[PDB]
Amino acid sequence: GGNYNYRYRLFRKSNLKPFERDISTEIYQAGSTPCNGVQGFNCYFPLQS
Amino acid sequence: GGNYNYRYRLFRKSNLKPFERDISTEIYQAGSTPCNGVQGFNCYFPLQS
């Protein structure tokens, strides 16, 4: 049926330092409008399955 | 950069009647545990970009 438990980060403001772990799960603002924690136009979830 | 503003339904309880449209965006419980509207193990968002 397809596993969807495994996910990876897709969006970040900046790259990661070596041996750095990022676990933050917050709405990513790709535009010039606040997202207010709402997925929508130009407001994407950071993790992808 | 990748247009991510186009999304489609991926999970639903059953098929659609002809000429029917659905817009609900509540979490999908793929397992035997309530998800409380939180993405996680066996709980996925119904839409994909």
Describe the structure.
- The structure is cut from a larger assembly and holds two copies of chain A (49 residues).
- By secondary structure, chain A is mainly β.
- Chain A has no helices and four strands.
- Chains A and B meet through loops of A and loops of B.
- It is classed as viral protein.
- The entry lists the keywords SARS-CoV-2, Spike protein, viral protein.
- Cryo-EM structure of SARS-CoV-2 S-Kappa variant (B.1.617.1), dimer of S trimer conformation 2.
Largest interface in this structure:
A-B, 9 and 9 residues
Percent of residues in beta strands of chain A: 15-25%
H-E string of chain A: EEEE
* C-alpha geometry of chain A: flat
Quaternary state of the chains? part of a larger assembly
Could you give the distance between the termini of chain A? 14 Å
Query: How many H/I helices of chain A?
Result: 0
Protein name (chains A, B): Spike protein S1
PDB class: viral protein
Keywords: SARS-CoV-2, Spike protein, viral protein
Entry title: Cryo-EM structure of SARS-CoV-2 S-Kappa variant (B.1.617.1), dimer of S trimer conformation 2
Provide a brief overview of the structure.
The structure is cut from a larger assembly and holds 2 copies of chain A (49 residues). With 49 residues, chain A is mainly β.
Secondary structure layout plus pairing:
The structure is cut from a larger assembly and holds two copies of chain A (49 residues).
Chain A: E1 8-9, E2 28-29, E3 43-44, E4 47-48
Could you list some keywords that capture this structure?
2 chains, 49 residues, two-stranded antiparallel ribbon, SARS-CoV-2, viral protein, two-stranded antiparallel sheet, part of a larger assembly, mainly beta, flat
